[PDB]
DNA sequence: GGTTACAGGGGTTACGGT
């Protein structure tokens, strides 16, 4: 179980006679497009179907996970393509181990993305942990690979590791552009508007890329903290409706799996986009004032009172 | 080398106090 971890945590590894990369590493935003070989498990998949525009290629889309990501993340987005016919992976159920030889990574919308090479191969195993015995179904020949002994071990582990496991919290000083992160914070300020909800929140730790709140402005109802101790969060859709008249100035919140972003004028922000498709599993929820996880915040607050 | 498939998806100036 650990021999798996050990190789993964390197970022790159090898089975049979070819070299893999882990998912987390691979999610690195590479500007230059490179040739990767992947192995993980299908946390989400679409049916193969012909695409309607351009070359109109056959296309299935999948999200490969491994232990270098948290159990919350679906993982790396990969679109597989076939110009030659419908020889794409026939995926039954989640938790199927999937190897993918000869995929490319390419960044888009500030998110690293898999795109398959024309001559891509794959190999696919069942969801061993399922009661159902038919979780693999027969696969199109053209793009298979006869997998060796070692990789079939790997497959049973990944399904096990996944099955058991189905977060990592930061201070606000520790968050950087374009990441998914989780944190406790107290609310300083809110602003509803027609089109969204906004929270200004803090854990009383300075982040370079936060706005510097002046003590010297006139007629501000912000009483503190001053400088770069507060992030703005923007809640869309369901997150708006739940918080708009629920979360209030001075509440202590815990926010899970939010996405960070630099706004137009160059300050780091939090976005919770609407997420109907149960994909990102982000949350924001009130925390009881006397909780032990909140006392590090309270203490820090004395130091800026 | 990266349309198709993505989606989603979007909002003034650190106040305004809606």
Residue numbers in the entry: 8 to 173, 199 to 337
From the paper:
The conserved shelterin complex caps chromosome ends to protect telomeres and regulate telomere replication. In fission yeast Schizosaccharomyces pombe, shelterin consists of telomeric single- and double-stranded DNA-binding modules Pot1-Tpz1 and Taz1-Rap1 connected by Poz1, and a specific component Ccq1. Here, we report the crystal structures of Pot1DBD-single-stranded-DNA, Pot1372-555-Tpz1185-212 and Tpz1425-470-Ccq1123-439 complexes and propose an integrated model depicting the assembly mechanism of the shelterin complex at telomeres. Overall, our findings provide valuable structural information regarding interactions within fission yeast shelterin complex at 3’ ss telomeric overhang.
